């Protein structure tokens, strides 16, 4: 009785705990509510924490499912992510890479 990776592959990156099966995000036990897009954004960054996520790479995974939007939309939504991560000081986790994308340091 403790933790299980099966049935619910949870991601733990720099204080963040993403529930993939419950679609909930936690830090410090606090439950953050993300959207279909914003959850996909954070999850993408979290799982690929050590990988610099190009805007279009994010754009292609999150928006890649019938959206037809400019990849700069990603930057915009990431900014909103920061806002929601502010109370948890997790906004700093998303490092901006000008011309490339975003990454979790």
Swiss-Prot record:
Signal peptide: none annotated. Phosphorylated by ArlS. Transmembrane segments: none annotated. Residues 9-105 bind DNA. Induction: Activated by Agr, SarA, SarV and MgrA. It is found in: Cytoplasm. Member of the two-component regulatory system ArlS/ArlR involved in the regulation of adhesion, autolysis, multidrug resistance and virulence. ArlS/ArlR affects expression of the multidrug resistance transporter NorA and interacts with both Agr (virulence accessory gene regulator) (negatively) and SarA (staphylococcal accessory regulator) (positively) to modulate several virulence factor genes, including ssp (serine protease), spa (surface protein A) and hla (alpha-hemolysin). Could inhibit biofilm development by a mechanism independent of the presence of the poly-N-acetylglucosamine (PNAG). This is Response regulator ArlR. It comes from Staphylococcus aureus (strain NCTC 8325 / PS 47). The chain holds residues 123 to 219 of 219 of the full protein.
